[PDB]
């Protein structure tokens, strides 16, 4: 009752994708696993602007394709998008065979998807934000079909500096990937996301933020903070606003203390190495940013330092520092 999906880390911790087999006999698709959205969409032979490197779903080549035909369309926070028509087919996730999952066949996708590593996305948010109302998500179906007993998935995202990788376990979790005991944290799923409250953020002995809300989003690269929190964190590290939602920060992290979040009475950090996301031409971009959101998007900068068990049933999460 447990599905294991080894992940690939794209570049410098940009995103984490895993293979999913769709159809009968089945084609293998590389999908970005995204707790910030709830649509499972794939490049298809109906697509008019997809990429030559992508695997394309062909309805005629699956014995278990079920027609649906309703339109779907999604737009993501980074400006990427896709759209097309619905269908149903069997979806094998780490060995667990979901029967008749609603899949979303792309007729169009943004150029960034056509030039990227993904054949599509696997949405792991809550079903109240599927772009077509009433679509049941993969986790909904794993639960309702009895393919997993525990309504959970455990998430390890690797660091490119350690060789990359990552691993999702559907129906369980992997204790070899984290330190100490898991801490339970309640989830607010009212906007479709894995919402939490951070009671306080600190750098060393200094408070850099009082309470703020955020979402645990495997499909966002950075730790995106409200502008005032972002600006306070930047001040703590001497970082300079690039005007585009990112900061320039020193490439030498040896004298940086971790950024520590207090969450439900326990501490979870961004490690000092992770305070740098990217180096280009001698300049470093910070692992935290801003985006004019009233809540934080707690993305890969944080998640690659903190193992999370996502529990859809409660809903709640359990968090522990990664073993590293």
């Amino acid at each position: 009752g447990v599905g294991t999906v080894p992940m690939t880390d794209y570049g410098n911790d940009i995103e984490y994708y895993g293979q999913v087999t769709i159809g009968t006999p089945g084609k293998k698709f590389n999908l970005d696993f995204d707790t910030g959205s709830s649509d499972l969409w794939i490049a298809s032979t109906l697509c008019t602007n997809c990429g030559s490197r992508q695997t394309k779903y062909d309805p005629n080549q699956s014995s278990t394709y079920q027609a649906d035909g309703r339109t779907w369309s999604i737009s993501y926070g980074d400006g990427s998008s896709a759209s097309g028509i619905l269908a149903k087919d069997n979806v094998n996730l780490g060995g667990l065979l979901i029967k008749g999952q609603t899949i979303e066949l792309a007729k169009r996708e943004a150029a960034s998807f056509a030039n990227g590593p993904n054949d599509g996305l696997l949405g792991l948010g809550f079903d109240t934000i599927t772009t077509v109302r009433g679509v049941k998500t993969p986790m909904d179906n794993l639960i309702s079909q009895g393919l997993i007993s525990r309504p959970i998935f455990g998430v390890y995202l690797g660091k490119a500096s350690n060789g990359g990788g990552g691993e999702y376990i559907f129906g369980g979790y992997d204790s070899t990937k984290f330190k100490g005991s898991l801490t339970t944290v309640p989830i607010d799923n009212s906007r479709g996301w894995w919402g939490i409250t951070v009671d306080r953020a600190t750098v060393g002995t200094s408070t850099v933020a009082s309470s703020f809300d955020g979402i645990l989003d495997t499909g966002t690269t950075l730790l995106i903070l409200p502008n005032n929190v972002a600006a306070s964190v930047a001040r703590a590290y001497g970082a300079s606003d690039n005007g585009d939602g990112t900061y320039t920060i020193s490439c030498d992290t040896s004298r940086f203390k971790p950024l520590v979040f207090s969450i439900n009475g326990a501490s979870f950090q961004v490690s000092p190495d992770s305070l740098v996301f990217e180096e280009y031409q001698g300049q470093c971009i910070a692992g935290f940013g801003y985006g004019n959101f009233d809540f934080a998007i707690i993305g890969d900068t944080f998640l690659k330092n903190n193992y999370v068990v996502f529990n859809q049933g409660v809903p709640e999460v359990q968090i522990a520092p990664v073993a590293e």
Partner: peptide, 4 residues
């Protein structure tokens, strides 16, 4: 970065 991505924001999805």
């Amino acid at each position: 970065a991505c924001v999805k």
